[PDB]
Amino acid sequence: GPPTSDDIFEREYKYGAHNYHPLPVALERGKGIYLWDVEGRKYFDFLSSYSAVNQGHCHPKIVNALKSQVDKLTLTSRAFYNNVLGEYEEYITKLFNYHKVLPMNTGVEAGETACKLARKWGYTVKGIQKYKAKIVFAAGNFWGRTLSAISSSTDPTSYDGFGPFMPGFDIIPYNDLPALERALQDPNVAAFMVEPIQGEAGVVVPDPGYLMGVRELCTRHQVLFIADEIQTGLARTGRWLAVDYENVRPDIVLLGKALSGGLYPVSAVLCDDDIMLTIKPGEHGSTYGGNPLGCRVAIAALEVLEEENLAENADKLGIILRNELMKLPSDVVTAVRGKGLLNAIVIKETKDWDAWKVCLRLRDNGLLAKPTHGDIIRFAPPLVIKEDELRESIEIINKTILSF
Template sequence: LKNRDVAAFIIEPIQGEGGVHIPEQGYLRQVRDLCTQYETLLIFDEIQTGFARTGTIFACQRDTVVPDIMCLGKSLGGGVMPISAFTTTEAIWDRAFGGVEKCALHTSTFGGNARACAAGIASIEVMIKEDLAEQTRGKGAYLLQGLRELQEKYPAMIKEVRGRGLLIGVEFNQLSGGFLNKVTGGKFNKIAEEYLAALVAGELMNRYQIITAYTLNNPNVIRFEPPLIVTREQLDTLLHALEDIFKKHTNIWSLILASGKNLIMK
């Protein structure tokens, strides 16, 4: 940034697809200070973290950091309507789009869709009226505690549990293939690293009708992002399902065989 040739610094307050990574306390504040010092715009991607997902309406509020630009989406549509939004300061907006000559600089065929906007307004109203941020803090703490108890019981399976609110990632340990890994020139462990989380997610879906998935850029992490209105009973169902899976399957071969049986039965 010292050369003052960087237009903007873009970051997720909590990494989503990277594997649900939470920055150290104070990191976002230091980023804000550096961007201000070197006149670089700070852009927060809150598409996954925004609208009470992490226990505050926006994840950056926990660090009392205000970006120059914020990108929003996903939860804004209440799970029923695709909608995204861009928000910024008045000064930046006027510089980019102010005046007749700039007003049409960026257009969209579906921009301002009335039905999508109505869904967005309704979602925000429910979020505020039912204090979903407060609910998320309590439910998230409950789920995190349950998952960490599973980690203590099954340390060979679970490497780490991390998250905030109802954005939680479970990273799995790499299950060594021993002799098979030597025979395959290390490919077995590579397969285990890339597919273990997917196999666990498959068991959750096929046997317990619980939909989840691994994070796109870290396939060894399952991400749990239930609806903010999820009940504790439903969270218990998830925890019991995971424990059942870990009890039955102590290695990757067991999970592979279980997945194969499901495919054959279908």
Template sequence: MERITLARALAMGREEARALDRDSPKGRLRSTPPGRDRLFIRAEGCRLWDDQGQVYLDFAGQGGTLSLGHNPAPVLEAVRLVAERPNLLQVGLDPVMSALMQNLAALAPEALARPLLTASGREAIRAAVGLARRATGRPRILVCEGASSDLSLDSWAAEPPPAETPTAAAPVAETAATATSAPPGTGLAAVPYGDLAALEEALAGREVAAFVVEPIQVEAGVLLPPPGYLQRARTLCRERGTLFIVDERRTGLGRTGTLFACQAEGIEPDILCLGPSLGGGVEPLGAVLTTEALWRQATARREGRWIETLLPEVGTRAAAAGLATLESLLDEGLPARAAELGAYLLARLESLQAEHHTVVKAVRGRGFLVGLEFEDVRSWATRLPFGGRGAFGPGGLATWVAGELLQRHRMLTHPVQPQVLLLAPPLTIGRNEIDQVVDALGQVLAGARPGWSLAVRSALTGLRHLRGGSPS
């Protein structure tokens, strides 16, 4: 296999890059949809530039993790300032990392005074589970059905129960509420999101180390919990001796209008997890915040190398990026901005829903984490002679709308479900950009009404995609 230098990779045009992507190990694992394989060569704020000189508006924000947009200047400058320092070092002092941990402790809910840095959001979840199992001596972990995509069953299966489990606890009885496809013996169960009765039943055996829950389920379709659900879930966990872990990898750091989404719900978790938005989109970074008492309880037993797996494995550059990200979020008042402009975005989308009620089923979200749920029109689309079964492709109407926004308006959005489109722009987005996207959505939805015009447009869109055509 030929080796490729960085200089050559940077100099590639679209066709060569497309062929490389298709033939590389990455391409064999994840194919890029035809017509959407743009080659972006520059990014700044909420905009991207491709190799053809076209400018795109990013309203996907990497699934909501680009809080400051692409290549934020303060974060890039912070990384530059520490460029000559050792990035990874097992000995010596690292005031940059210590400062980030102190700032996280100062900003988090009051009791969460013990932060732990990780190299990714997924590692943050794994570390949180390790802490919970260690502190409680219980092997089982409870999650919600439809949790974020990288909160996978395989990840949980790879995390063994603690060696010092006091007794061989019997598995929680599998019911319709707790059934999961997890391999036997992983200690994993799942309950429906928002179902307190199912949660109470799953916790009844007092064998669950932790319940992991998202304040808003993004990948499941931007689902908000019923009012009071999180507070009652917190109480149930406390009564059963189960730790309450809040997964804020997608909702944290201002995206929903408060610094942490759990603050708006009036709850204080035992463990809080943060994800890649902490690195400002420049450096990979995650974090776990817990209480001092829980940390001491989890680390009281020091046999083996378990403690080393929870030590910070991030570098000085990532810590500097985290410091700059927090500073920008606070100095620019971005959480409050997300609350104000997010309400404006929701109001405009609700007006759009009223106008296109035969296509748009629901609009929901908080701050700059918003989902549009479309009606499932694939049933009638199969009767259209031009559209046929492939009118919207395998992804449903959300994928079709996203493709139209990209092709015709040069706007990036993210289908998280076949019928749900996620809008999660950088928190620095302005009112004018919001208007542009909503107006473009209106134009796209005007062509998404059941009828012949949609069949023709769908067929033309499919042909343009197959040809890899540029936006009109």
């Protein structure tokens, strides 16, 4: 017979690096909102691969785009032109109303590109002396595992044992306008990079007016507002961008994950000419960035998001989901938070009972969620879920919670 779940666990333990401690479940099939393991058990996916499958697993239109393009051409490198990249660039720039896009593959590559753009713009446009440019980040931020990304982190597990760290990165508290103003008193600050909702920190939603104030402060002090929407963008929070909830237009928008529906690593950096063109030919890029296969996939994924009106569905069903989650008793769940279909709950962890055990029992009851910090549980199903499926999942959550 084929491998069992424990066979798969043991094989990975033997031949793979131990850089993850995943939830004990071995998936082999995904379709829409559902996942199946090698034993044939069916699960609601309430993580959505950290929003990479906002469109559901293996969405047939994105799958068809990939299958169609793979027989024609997949990679020429950027040493030559392919016929697909410009179509995708026009589509996405007109969709988000920026002059230009720079394509990359992973989220952390988009963040590194944004840091390089901010620095080059600080030196060549703002007039900062080389190399004194600073980039400000918010405590609790997460945007990857490169040495640069962990150099801006306040999480010891990310940076411990990996120094020395990148200079020129400053950290202020999240959701703190006065701290940002104080930080931006320094004319050598080139940019402020921030998530409109901090996902990895436990779905931390800042107060109303925070993004508006960030925009005002960055514009006043000639500082680039970099909005990291790699997790929050593309309809997950109920809008094309979480930033849309306050009509805020960042200087640089970072997109990823759902940009491909999970079929290909695609990320994007969006900004206007005065920022984008500070990087001259030969000064940045990557081998797979902007390849025709990923571009076909991304066009199809964006089209799925727009056609099926997934942002509106996420807004409505997230209202329903948060309202049902708040019905849970306050001595088992202390906080419910989120926007759209990016939500989390906080349990009052005991020494006996924590979020990992709750997620194990949810797994046993047919729903897959991931815990965080030992007391946070994220609930983020694909945006193609319907109300009846959502209510079945909600009753599963209720039964599992109050079954302890």
